[PDB]
Structure 1
Amino acid sequence: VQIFGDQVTEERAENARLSAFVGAIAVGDLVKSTLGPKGMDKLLQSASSNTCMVTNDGATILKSIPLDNPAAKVLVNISKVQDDEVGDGTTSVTVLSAELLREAEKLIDQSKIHPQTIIEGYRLASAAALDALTKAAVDNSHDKTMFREDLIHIAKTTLSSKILSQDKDHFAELATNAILRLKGSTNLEHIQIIKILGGKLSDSFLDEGFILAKKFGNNQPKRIENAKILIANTTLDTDKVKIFGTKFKVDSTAKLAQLEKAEREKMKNKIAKISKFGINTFINRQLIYDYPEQLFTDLGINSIEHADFEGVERLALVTGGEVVSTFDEPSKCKLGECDVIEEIMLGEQPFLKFSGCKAGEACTIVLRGATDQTLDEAERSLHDALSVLSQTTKETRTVLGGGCAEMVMSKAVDTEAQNIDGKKSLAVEAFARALRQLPTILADNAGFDSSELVSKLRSSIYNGISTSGLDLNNGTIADMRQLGIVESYKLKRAVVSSASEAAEVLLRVDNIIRARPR
Structure 2
Amino acid sequence: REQGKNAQRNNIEAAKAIADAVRTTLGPKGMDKMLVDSIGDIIISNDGATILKEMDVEHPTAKMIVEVSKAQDTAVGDGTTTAVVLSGELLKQAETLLDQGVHPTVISNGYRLAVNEARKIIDEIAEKSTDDATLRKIALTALSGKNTGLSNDFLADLVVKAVNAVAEVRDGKTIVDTANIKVDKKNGGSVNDTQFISGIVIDKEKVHSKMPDVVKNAKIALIDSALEIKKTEIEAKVQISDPSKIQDFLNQETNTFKQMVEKIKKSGANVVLCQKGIDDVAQHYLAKEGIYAVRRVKKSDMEKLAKATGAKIVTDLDDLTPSVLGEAETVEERKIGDDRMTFVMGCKNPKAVSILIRGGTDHVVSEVERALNDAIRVVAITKEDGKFLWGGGAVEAELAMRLAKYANSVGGREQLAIEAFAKALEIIPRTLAENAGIDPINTLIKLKADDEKGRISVGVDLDNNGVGDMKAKGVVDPLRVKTHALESAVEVATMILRIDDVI
The match for 1:274 among 264, 269, 273 is: 264
Give the distance between the partners of 2:381 and 2:348, measured in 1 at CA.
26
Q: CA deviation at 1:66?
A: 2.6
| Deviation sequence 1:301-346 (CA, Å, 0-9, x none) | 2222221211211222333433345455676613233334443223
Give the distance between the partners of 2:454 and 2:344, measured in 1 at CA.
54
Provide closer, same or farther for how the CA distance between residues 67 and 296 of structure 1 changes in structure 2, counting only shifts above 3 A.
Answer: closer
**Is the 1:320–1:337 contact (alpha carbons within 8 Å) kept by the matching residues of 2?**
yes
**Is the 1:132–1:409 contact (alpha carbons within 8 Å) kept by the matching residues of 2?**
yes
Tell me the secondary structure at the aligned position of residue 160 of structure 1.
coil
Which residue does 1:235 correspond to in 2? 226
Tell me the secondary structure at the aligned position of residue 195 of structure 1.
strand
Counting only pairs closer than 5 Å after superposition, residues 142-221 of structure 1 correspond to structure 2 as: 146-164=130-148, 166-184=150-168, 188=178, 190-216=180-206, 217-221=208-212
Provide closer, same or farther for how the CA distance between residues 246 and 168 of structure 1 changes in structure 2, counting only shifts above 3 A.
Answer: same
Which residue does 1:367 correspond to in 2? 357
Q: CA deviation at 1:501?
A: 1.5
Q: Which amino acid aligns with 1:121?
A: G
Counting only pairs closer than 5 Å after superposition, residues 335-414 of structure 1 correspond to structure 2 as: 335-414=325-404
Instruction: Verify: 1:38 aligned to 2:22, yes or no.
Output: no
Instruction: Verify: 1:427 aligned to 2:417, yes or no.
Output: yes
Q: CA deviation at 1:443?
A: 1.0
Consecutive unaligned residues of structure 2, counting only runs of 5 or more, are: 169-174
Q: CA deviation at 1:432?
A: 0.7
Give the distance between the partners of 1:226 and 1:284, measured in 2 at CA.
19
Provide closer, same or farther for how the CA distance between residues 506 and 270 of structure 1 changes in structure 2, counting only shifts above 3 A.
Answer: closer
Provide closer, same or farther for how the CA distance between residues 118 and 288 of structure 1 changes in structure 2, counting only shifts above 3 A.
Answer: same
Give the distance between the partners of 1:156 and 1:356, measured in 2 at CA.
29
The match for 1:22 among 13, 18, 22 is: 13
| Deviation sequence 1:235-278 (CA, Å, 0-9, x none) | 3321334x334555655343564455445445433432322233
The match for 1:456 among 429, 446, 449 is: 446
Tell me the secondary structure at the aligned position of residue 353 of structure 1.
strand
Instruction: Verify: 1:55 aligned to 2:39, yes or no.
Output: no
Give the distance between the partners of 2:413 and 2:269, measured in 1 at CA.
78
Which residue does 1:119 correspond to in 2? 108
Q: Which amino acid aligns with 1:306?
A: R
**Is the 1:121–1:428 contact (alpha carbons within 8 Å) kept by the matching residues of 2?**
yes
**Is the 2:57–2:63 contact (alpha carbons within 8 Å) kept by the matching residues of 1?**
yes
The worse-fitting range, judged by mean Cα deviation, of 188-197 and 340-349 is: 188-197
Give the distance between the partners of 1:213 and 1:37, measured in 2 at CA.
33
The worse-fitting range, judged by mean Cα deviation, of 444-453 and 58-67 is: 58-67
Provide closer, same or farther for how the CA distance between residues 235 and 253 of structure 1 changes in structure 2, counting only shifts above 3 A.
Answer: farther
**Is the 1:402–1:480 contact (alpha carbons within 8 Å) kept by the matching residues of 2?**
yes
**Is the 2:229–2:256 contact (alpha carbons within 8 Å) kept by the matching residues of 1?**
no
Give the distance between the partners of 1:442 and 1:194, measured in 2 at CA.
31
Counting only pairs closer than 5 Å after superposition, residues 26-105 of structure 1 correspond to structure 2 as: 26-46=17-37, 48-49=38-39, 51-105=41-95
Q: Which amino acid aligns with 1:45?
A: V
Which residue does 1:132 correspond to in 2? 121
Give the distance between the partners of 1:36 and 1:182, measured in 2 at CA.
29
Q: Which amino acid aligns with 1:126?
A: V
Instruction: Verify: 1:507 aligned to 2:491, yes or no.
Output: no
The worse-fitting range, judged by mean Cα deviation, of 251-260 and 347-356 is: 251-260
Give the distance between the partners of 2:241 and 2:36, measured in 1 at CA.
66
Q: Which amino acid aligns with 1:159?
A: L
| Deviation sequence 1:446-500 (CA, Å, 0-9, x none) | 1222222222222222323333323222225443333323232211110000111
Give the distance between the partners of 2:253 and 2:19, measured in 1 at CA.
66
Provide closer, same or farther for how the CA distance between residues 256 and 49 of structure 1 changes in structure 2, counting only shifts above 3 A.
Answer: closer
**Is the 1:37–1:165 contact (alpha carbons within 8 Å) kept by the matching residues of 2?**
no
Give the distance between the partners of 2:236 and 2:89, measured in 1 at CA.
69
The match for 1:11 among 2, 5, 10 is: 2
Counting only pairs closer than 5 Å after superposition, residues 477-488 of structure 1 correspond to structure 2 as: 477-488=467-478
Decide which structure has greater strand share. 2
Which residue does 2:171 correspond to in 1? none
The normalised TM-score by structure 1 is 0.87
| Deviation sequence 1:32-62 (CA, Å, 0-9, x none) | 211111011111132x237111111222222
Provide closer, same or farther for how the CA distance between residues 61 and 297 of structure 1 changes in structure 2, counting only shifts above 3 A.
Answer: closer
Tell me the secondary structure at the aligned position of residue 337 of structure 1.
strand
Give the distance between the partners of 1:305 and 1:502, measured in 2 at CA.
46
Tell me the secondary structure at the aligned position of residue 463 of structure 2.
coil
The worse-fitting range, judged by mean Cα deviation, of 167-176 and 194-203 is: 194-203
Q: CA deviation at 1:73?
A: 1.6
Q: Which amino acid aligns with 2:39?
A: S
The normalised TM-score by structure 2 is 0.90
Which residue does 2:281 correspond to in 1? 291
**Is the 2:268–2:322 contact (alpha carbons within 8 Å) kept by the matching residues of 1?**
no
Work out the percentage of aligned pairs sharing the same amino acid: 34
Give the distance between the partners of 1:13 and 1:316, measured in 2 at CA.
57
Q: Which amino acid aligns with 2:187?
A: L
Provide closer, same or farther for how the CA distance between residues 404 and 330 of structure 1 changes in structure 2, counting only shifts above 3 A.
Answer: same
Give the distance between the partners of 1:499 and 1:297, measured in 2 at CA.
58
Tell me the secondary structure at the aligned position of residue 433 of structure 1.
helix
Give the distance between the partners of 1:300 and 1:50, measured in 2 at CA.
41
